[PDB]
Amino acid sequence: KVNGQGGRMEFSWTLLDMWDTINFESTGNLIAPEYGFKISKRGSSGIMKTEGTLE
Amino acid sequence: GLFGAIAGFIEGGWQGMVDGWYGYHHSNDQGSGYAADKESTQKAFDGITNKVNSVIEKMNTVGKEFSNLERRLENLNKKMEDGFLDVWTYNAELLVLMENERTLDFHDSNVKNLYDKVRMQLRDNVKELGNGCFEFYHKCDDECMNSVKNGTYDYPKYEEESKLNRNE
Ligand SMILES: *[C@@H]1O[C@H](CO)[C@@H](O)[C@H](O)[C@H]1NC(C)=O
Numbered sequence: 001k002v003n004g005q006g007g008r009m010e011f012s013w014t015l016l017d018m019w020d021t022i023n024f025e026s027t028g029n030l031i032a033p034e035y036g037f038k039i040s041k042r043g044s045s046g047i048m049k050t051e052g053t054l055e
Numbered sequence: 056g057l058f059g060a061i062a063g064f065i066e067g068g069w070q071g072m073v074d075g076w077y078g079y080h081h082s083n084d085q086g087s088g089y090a091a092d093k094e095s096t097q098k099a100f101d102g103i104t105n106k107v108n109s110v111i112e113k114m115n116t117v118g119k120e121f122s123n124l125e126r127r128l129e130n131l132n133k134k135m136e137d138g139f140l141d142v143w144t145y146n147a148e149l150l151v152l153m154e155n156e157r158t159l160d161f162h163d164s165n166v167k168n169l170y171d172k173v174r175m176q177l178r179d180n181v182k183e184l185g186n187g188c189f190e191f192y193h194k195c196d197d198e199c200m201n202s203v204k205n206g207t208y209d210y211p212k213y214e215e216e217s218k219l220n221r222n223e
Pocket residue numbers: 019020021
């Protein structure tokens with residue numbers, strides 16, 4: 001048990017192309033996207049590990 | 056060091072010369088003083104500026120995460136970054152030491168060349184004391200002193216006058 005639960009949710013992702021069509025089919029146990037993330041800006045950046053906050 | 060002038064035959068520095076890295080001191084009946092040789096100073100400065108610049112320009116050129124199944128890859132990453140780090144730190148520390156050495160010797164050489172210039176100009180019209188000073192065998196006034204300084208000194212003019220005095 002974690003969070004009370006012995007059940008699990010296994011998540012996968014993908015990058016959908018321009019004009020590409022993605023297709024879902026399930027007889028059960030699908031946890032499905034309502035939304036999806038367009039990339040509105042691209043460029044040099046990263047992820048900084050810190051316990052701090054912005055000033 | 057190398058050219059044997061700074062901390063050389065010329066035994067110490069002049070706190071009294073504030074206008075330059077290298078220069079003259081003179082005394083005569085007209086007066087006495089320190090004078091920087093502004094040309095040589097500025098030129099050396101330009102050289103040093105070039106040096107440090109070239110050090111900056113040549114040197115002027117994110118993390119990632121990994122799973123627990125990705126131990127070799129992760130380590131490969133680390134060894135790479137660390138490798139490049141070690142290489143650049145080495146290059147910097149080294150470059151700094153060596154160029155420092157070169158720089159001090161460059162200054163020494165500059166002094167030596169200046170002294171030489173004055174000596175080879177004055178010839179036997181003076182005694183060469185070996186402390187960096189020359190004592191004149193003829194009377195040298197401010198015009199003559201400046202002529203020495205500005206590189207124009209006239210040997211034949213003071214020649215036989217110096218001769219007689221050097222002899223008697
Ligand atoms: C998706 O819709 C657009 C409408 O602008 C169409 O031009 C495109 O061909 C469609 N893609 C597919 C794979 O059906």
